[PDB]
Structure formats: structure tokens, C-alpha cells
């Protein structure tokens, strides 16, 4: 199945999702340290919840301030609030 970029991620606390917006993308200007979650993504699990966490995270030891977010959407896919 497809991979959805949503703000709802399993096995994560509310503190980690505080920086994420309603669309699942980190706010512009937020200061993120190593290990922080930037873009929330869920991948369908095996046939055998049924979703695994494949969200993008800041690499360990990398800090900084989010200054720009660019979203590229293929035609035929509904655009989110950030786009």
C-alpha cells in the first residue's frame, strides 16, 4: 500500500508530536536537536495497528533551526495544508 504522511504516529509520546503541526510536518522556526521528529510517516505493515513508524528524524548530533519546508506532490494526490 501507499505511505501516508500523517501527524498520527504509533508508539510516540505527545511531547514528540508537539513540534509537528496538524499536517505532520515540523513548524517553521522550531529548534530541533538530534533524534527529534520532523516529518511523520507511516508505512503499511506485513499481511501476516498495521502501520510501522518510518518518520524522518534529525540525525544524532545534528542541531539547528527549521528555516524552510518544501513539499512536492505528484499530480492526482490531494495536497495537504502545508502545500
Amino acid at each position: 500500500g501507499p505511505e501516508e504522511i500523517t501527524a498520527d504516529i504509533p508508539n510516540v509520546g505527545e511531547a514528540a508530536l508537539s513540534k509537528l503541526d496538524e499536517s505532520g510536518i515540523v513548524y517553521i522556526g522550531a529548534e530541533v536537536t538530534g533524534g527529534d521528529i520532523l516529518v511523520g510517516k507511516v508505512t503499511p505493515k506485513g499481511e501476516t495497528s498495521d502501520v510501522k513508524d518510518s518518520s524522518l528524524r534529525v540525525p544524532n548530533g545534528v542541531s539547528g533551526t527549521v528555516i524552510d519546508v518544501q513539499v512536492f506532490t505528484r499530480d492526482g494526490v490531494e495536497k495537504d495544508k502545508r502545500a
Binding site: 513548524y27 517553521i28 522556526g29 522550531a30 529548534e31 533551526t65 527549521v66 528555516i67
Partner: protein, 232 residues
């Protein structure tokens, strides 16, 4: 000889400018002038308390690496300009000033809202420039009293409620002095020839008086030497 040491006294203070100043210590015994001058210069250049800008908050700005519509200077340039602001605080030890400006023109330190305790030494210090009639700037500036150079990276260590998006951290250089020089010359007291007079020239930001700075440096030196007085 044993008790013949002449105690130096603050003779004359010359204020040639708002920032530049000159102080004189006289009389001084042979050799003591260089020691006192070096100690005072080293203490003053490092451990002089002063007030500096710590945090800034602009309404329309989310982070330093951004721009505001209607201002010529970048947000980073605005923070750098605010870093050099000279402000004296009497008792609060922590002040939050507000700046509001509109219309085309140079926004300087004179546009900061009046507070009774605080005082701006340089009202003509330019902060930014508004290049649009409809452009308006509103800013909150946090001023804190401290000592030495404290970069914002060390201040990041504090973790109470994090920081809201839009609060910009500014490196603080609390030292009010920027240049200290000293020179020993011949002094004339009665009929004694082997006496010295010390002249100390201080260039600061204008937020501290030369006499107060000299008194503070002497107090710090005496407190440090009190450990050697009682060696135990």
C-alpha cells in the same frame, strides 16, 4: 622604610568624552605603580559587571534567518545591532523594554519606550531602517545584568518550558569596558623624588563611571588577596 609606604589616593578624574575617561592615582612608591596598573587593567577588562541584551521577540518574525517586509536590515543584522546597545539598569537586574515604530526612517535606540529606572547611554544608536510608509515594527527586548561573555549556547542548557517559536537568543557581552591603558610618570610630593603617579585611561560603552569601576576592581583585588593575608 618598613612603614614608609605611601597609600595611593584617587587625585583627579578627567572625563574627556562620554566614553573615554582618565583617572589618576598618586602618590605611588617605586615599583608599585606597574603592579597596581597591571592588576587593575587585568581585573577591569575581565570582571566588570554590566547590562546587556539577552533575548528579543518581534511580532512578525519566527527565526533569525528570516526577513521582515519593510525593513532594510535582516533579522540577524537587527540582532547584531541590538547586541551593541548600551543600557544602564538601576535595580531591577532584568528589564523588558518595548519598541514601536512606523513610517520611513531610521529606527534608533531613542524610540524605545521610556522606563524610569533604565537609561539609554546612546540614544542615536541605530537599530534598523524602515523603508515603507505602511511598514511597522514592534519589538520586545530583554536586558539582563551579568559579567563576562556568556554565549547563548551555554544559556540553552536551561530547560524549564523550552522557548516559544519567535524568541531569538542574543549573545551577551556584559563587559562595559573595551579598552584599558595605564602609564606611570614621575610624581612630585613635598621634597621626595622617588615617587610615582599612575594614569589609567579607560574607553568604555558609557554605562559605568571610571571611579565606580576602579572601586570595584580594588574591592575584587582585596577580596582575592584576603586569602593570602591569612595563609593558614
Amino acid at each position: 622604610s618598613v612603614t614608609e609606604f605611601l597609600k595611593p589616593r584617587l587625585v583627579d578624574i578627567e572625563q574627556v568624552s562620554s566614553t573615554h575617561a582618565k583617572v589618576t592615582l598618586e602618590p605611588l612608591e617605586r615599583g608599585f605603580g606597574h603592579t597596581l596598573g597591571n592588576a587593575l587593567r587585568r581585573i577591569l577588562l575581565s570582571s566588570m559587571p554590566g547590562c546587556a541584551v539577552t533575548e528579543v521577540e518581534i511580532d512578525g518574525v519566527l527565526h533569525e534567518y528570516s526577513t521582515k517586509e519593510g525593513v532594510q536590515e535582516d533579522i540577524l543584522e537587527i540582532l547584531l545591532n541590538l547586541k551593541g546597545l548600551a543600557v544602564r539598569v538601576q535595580g531591577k537586574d532584568e528589564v523588558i523594554l518595548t519598541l514601536n515604530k512606523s513610517g520611513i526612517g531610521p529606527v534608533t535606540a531613542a524610540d524605545i519606550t521610556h522606563d524610569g529606572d533604565v537609561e539609554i547611554v546612546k540614544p542615536q544608536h541605530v537599530i534598523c531602517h524602515l523603508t515603507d510608509e505602511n511598514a511597522s515594527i514592534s519589538m520586545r527586548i530583554k536586558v539582563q545584568r551579568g559579567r563576562g561573555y556568556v554565549p547563548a549556547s551555554t544559556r540553552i542548557h536551561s530547560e524549564e518550558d523550552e522557548r516559544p517559536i519567535g524568541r531569538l537568543l542574543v549573545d551577551a557581552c556584559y563587559s562595559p569596558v573595551e579598552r584599558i591603558a595605564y602609564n606611570v610618570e614621575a610624581a612630585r610630593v613635598e621634597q621626595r623624588t622617588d615617587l610615582d603617579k599612575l594614569v589609567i585611561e579607560m574607553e568604555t560603552n558609557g554605562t559605568i563611571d571610571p571611579e565606580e569601576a576602579i572601586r570595584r576592581a580594588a574591592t575584587i583585588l582585596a577580596e582575592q588577596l584576603e586569602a593570602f593575608v591569612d595563609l593558614r
